[PDB]
Design an enzyme around this catalytic site. Structure first.
Site, PDB file in Angstrom:
ATOM      1  N   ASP A 194       0.859  -1.192   0.000  1.00  0.00           N
ATOM      2  CA  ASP A 194       0.000   0.000   0.000  1.00  0.00           C
ATOM      3  C   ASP A 194       0.885   1.227   0.000  1.00  0.00           C
ATOM      4  OD1 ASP A 194      -2.286   1.911   0.458  1.00  0.00           O
ATOM      5  OD2 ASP A 194      -3.386   0.029   0.775  1.00  0.00           O
ATOM      6  N   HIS A 217       1.929   1.696  -3.158  1.00  0.00           N
ATOM      7  CA  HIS A 217       1.012   2.529  -3.929  1.00  0.00           C
ATOM      8  C   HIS A 217       1.541   3.942  -4.038  1.00  0.00           C
ATOM      9  CE1 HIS A 217      -2.679  -0.301  -3.125  1.00  0.00           C
ATOM     10  NE2 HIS A 217      -1.647  -0.936  -3.722  1.00  0.00           N
TER      11      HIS A 217
END
Ligand SMILES: *[C@@H]1O[C@H](CO)[C@@H](O[C@@H]2O[C@H](CO)[C@@H](O)[C@H](O)[C@H]2NC(C)=O)[C@H](O)[C@H]1NC(C)=O
Ligand SMILES: *[C@@H]1O[C@H](CO)[C@@H](O)[C@H](O)[C@H]1NC(C)=O
Ligand SMILES: *[C@H]1O[C@H](CO)[C@@H](O)[C@H](O)[C@@H]1O
EC number: 3.2.1.-
Length: 372
Positions: A194, A217
């Site tokens: 993430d 991410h």
């Protein structure tokens, strides 16, 4: 004074009380030592609140219980609330905090309602230093800073989340930096699934200098605007190596309508990024959490000013080739972004940048069709 917590030596025995007693005894200006080669079993929340200018030297392994029933809906595995003066550090470099997250990832994969704790949760307080150690397999976020914490430094950290199954380590954000001032993150390596660093509402004066992120991410502003007026300001990020990430860097804001608020992002610089097989080099999302038709009726009005993207190099993945960036600014917002030294190419050698609502002085050639 220096205190060494008694290690029970067995995973069925919770060492947390021994640890907090050591902190209570020595934590007023003293030192707590987890010796090299030791293993402590932490089967409950470890609250560091008795620390006042204390030094916690982690040279061994602190292994949290997986106990998913216990951790369910809990805020923090290590809770650092209103602490003034803390050093949480490995001076040998051998210290490891193991969040034992596998069970949580597998449970979350089957049941998205399962709520997981943050591994190191800092709220309020001041003068906190976290350094030299490895954080391994957090159930969820590695590190969070909020509650108006000030002067927080993360240095020389190795952070990794790797699943032993087909279920990924979801939402293992490296750093979620919220309400705080003067946070520094430097010389850190992150392997996760993430955001590498997420700048959350009320972050201000954050420096990130020299960071490597794999599978992340990206270095990400937001999301902002979900249910309130949110701001992120005065952010400086330099020397980021972004490998196999969904985006190297970006900004994400909710559109208008419903309970959404307005997002303000001012004075954010992303400098000296190396893109290695990341899907986009840079991305702006102004329709976060909604679809295209919703955003047509409820335009984004985020106020982005003095956003600087400078010295990006490398190669994106095959995924969006030829597109290397998707700058979907909101129709009713300000899109104050300037790009320079943007030398990123797709594998084909092309370098298309999709744009909507971008300014005349953007600094790269635009192609219409941005979305998100
Ligand atoms: C834009 O943001 C940067 C990054 O936070 C600001 O520079 C920082 O300012 C603080 C407060 O003076 C210092 O403690 C840091 O040393 C600075 N960091 C860096 C990396 O330089 C800058 O002041 C902001 N600019 C404006 C015009 O608001
Ligand atoms: C990045 O992705 C590539 C392609 O899937 C893979 O071969 C490589 O091992 C990954 N790199 C790292 C450092 O995990
Ligand atoms: C507790 O014990 C450890 C290991 O002997 C020491 O390193 C520490 O200083 C404290 O005395």
């Amino acid at each position: 004074a220096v205190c060494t917590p008694t290690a029970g030596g067995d995973s069925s025995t919770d060492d947390v009380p021994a640890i907090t007693e050591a902190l209570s005894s020595c934590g007023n200006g003293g030192t707590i030592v987890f010796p090299e080669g030791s293993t402590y079993y932490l089967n409950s929340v470890l609250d560091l609140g008795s620390c006042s200018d204390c030094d916690i030297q982690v040279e061994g392994l602190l292994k949290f219980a997986s106990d998913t029933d216990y951790w369910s809906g809990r805020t923090a595995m290590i809770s650092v609330s209103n602490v003034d003066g803390l050093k949480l550090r490995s001076l040998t470099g051998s210290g490891v905090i193991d969040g034992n997250g596998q069970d949580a990832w597998d449970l979350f994969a089957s049941d998205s309602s399962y709520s997981r704790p943050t591994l190191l949760y800092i709220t309020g307080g001041s003068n906190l230093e976290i350094s030299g150690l490895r954080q391994k397999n957090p159930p969820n976020v590695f590190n969070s800073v909020k509650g108006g914490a000030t002067n927080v430094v993360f240095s020389n950290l190795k952070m990794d989340a790797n699943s032993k199954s087909d279920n990924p380590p979801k939402n293992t954000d490296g750093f979620d930096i919220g309400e705080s001032t003067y946070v520094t993150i430097t010389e850190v390596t992150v392997v996760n699934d993430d955001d590498c660093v997420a700048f959350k509402p009320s972050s201000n004066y954050v420096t990130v200098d020299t960071i490597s992120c794999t599978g992340s991410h990206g270095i990400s502003v937001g999301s902002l605007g979900k249910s309130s007026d949110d701001s992120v300001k005065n952010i400086y990020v330099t020397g980021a190596t972004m490998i196999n990430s969904t985006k190297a860097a970006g900004i994400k804001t909710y559109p208008s309508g419903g309970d959404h608020g307005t997002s303000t992002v001012s004075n954010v610089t992303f400098n000296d990024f190396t893109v290695d097989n990341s899907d986009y080099a840079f991305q702006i999302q102004s329709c976060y959490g909604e679809d295209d038709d919703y955003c047509e009726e409820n335009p984004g009005n985020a106020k982005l000013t003095d956003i600087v993207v400078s010295s990006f190099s490398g190669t994106t993945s095959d995924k969006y080739d030829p597109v290397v960036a998707n700058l979907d600014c909101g129709a009713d917002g300000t899109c104050g972004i300037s790009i320079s030294g943007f030398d990123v190419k797709a594998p084909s050698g092309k370098s298309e940048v999709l744009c909507a609502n971008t300014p005349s002085d953007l600094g790269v050639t635009c192609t219409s069709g941005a979305s998100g």
